[PDB]
Amino acid sequence: MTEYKLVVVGACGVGKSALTIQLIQNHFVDEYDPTIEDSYRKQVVIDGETSLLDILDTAGQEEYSAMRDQYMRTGEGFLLVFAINNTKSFEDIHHYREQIKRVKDSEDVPMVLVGNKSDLPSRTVDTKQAQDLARSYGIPFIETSAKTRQGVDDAFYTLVREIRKHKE
Ligand SMILES: *CCC(=O)N1CCN(c2ncnc3cc(-c4ccccc4F)c(Cl)cc23)CC1
Ligand SMILES: Nc1nc2c(ncn2[C@@H]2O[C@H](COP(=O)(O)OP(=O)(O)O)[C@@H](O)[C@H]2O)c(=O)[nH]1
Ligand SMILES: [Ca+2]
Ligand SMILES: [Ca+2]
Numbered sequence: 544m545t546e547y548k549l550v551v552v553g554a555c556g557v558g559k560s561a562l563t564i565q566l567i568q569n570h571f572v573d574e575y576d577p578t579i580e581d582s583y584r585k586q587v588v589i590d591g592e593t594s595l596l597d598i599l600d601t602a603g604q605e606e607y608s609a610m611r612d613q614y615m616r617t618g619e620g621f622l623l624v625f626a627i628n629n630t631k632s633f634e635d636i637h638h639y640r641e642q643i644k645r646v647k648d649s650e651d652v653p654m655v656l657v658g659n660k661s662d663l664p665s666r667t668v669d670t671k672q673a674q675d676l677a678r679s680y681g682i683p684f685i686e687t688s689a690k691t692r693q694g695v696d697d698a699f700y701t702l703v704r705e706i707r708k709h710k711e
Contacts, residue, residue, distance in 0.1 A: 546595045547706050548617050549699065552639045553624030554632040555602075558659040561689035562624065563600045566699055571690050578602055589700050596703070615646045620653035620706040622698060625668065626660045627686070633668045640680065653705040654682045657698050662688040 551559045560575040567583045580602045587594050599614060621643055625632040636656065644650055656677045658668065670686070677684035683701050687694035 544593045544595070545707075546597065547703050548597045548599070548619045549622065549702055549706075550599045550601060550615060550618035550620070551622045551624060552601050552643070553622070553657075554626075554629070554635045557624045557626045557629065557632050558687075558689045559602070559622075559624050560600050562622075562657070562659060562687060562695055562698070563598055565689050565692055565695050567598070571692075578604075587700070587703075589703050590707075592707075594703050596699070598699075612646050615643070618643075618647075620655075620702045620709075622655055622657050622702060623682075624657040624659055625673075627658045627666045627668050628660055628663045630667045633673070636676070651709065653702065653709045654680070655698055655702045655705060656680070656682055656684045658684065658686045659689060661686040661693060662690050 551563055553559055555577060561572050563583060564570065564572050564575065567585055581600055583598045583600065585596045587596060599618065603611065623636050623639055625636055643652055656673060658673050674684055685694050685698045685701055687698050689695060
């Protein structure tokens, strides 16, 4: 039925590929090529409605390109991923949201804030601080672990729900 282009963004090392490969292939990768950018496709039923998801896992370099902008424009929703043990990656969220706003030429873009690595005890970003950030953005916040699979489906499916809400 409906096709959704989902884009997974966030700093290096936060778990973007690990989340995406869990969702698609149902295993946890311990180290995956940090530069590679690929898309993945999956059909899922969400709220009784079949959804064909096309998921772009971002990586590459810390640089502007017209080519990356082109692909980011195709996205209909974005996962803003940080790691709960990496404060810099949380500080970086703001940058990704701003660059999304730029390429979509919209401040109302479907997004979900994802705090990954929830299985690690050594947390440095409090749930409250991330919840307050998500509240300021008007988006959901979901804690995940690509390692245990806690919240992985929920994060992607909540982003599809956000895209559906926005399209109406
Ligand atoms: C370790 C490799 C990795 O995961 N990344 C490389 C650095 N990336 C990155 N660095 C800075 N800026 C961005 C900006 C974007 C972006 C551009 C336009 C719209 C939306 C958007 F997120 C991206 Cl895709 C990656 C950047 C990515 C992480
Ligand atoms: N403990 C833990 N490690 C994770 C989790 N997600 C990713 N990692 C690890 O963190 C590192 C970076 O993951 P990766 O998916 O390559 O990050 P990316 O640069 O954002 O794509 C790898 O060692 C992964 O195994 C998680 O939820 N829990
Ligand atoms: Ca990656
Ligand atoms: Ca909103």
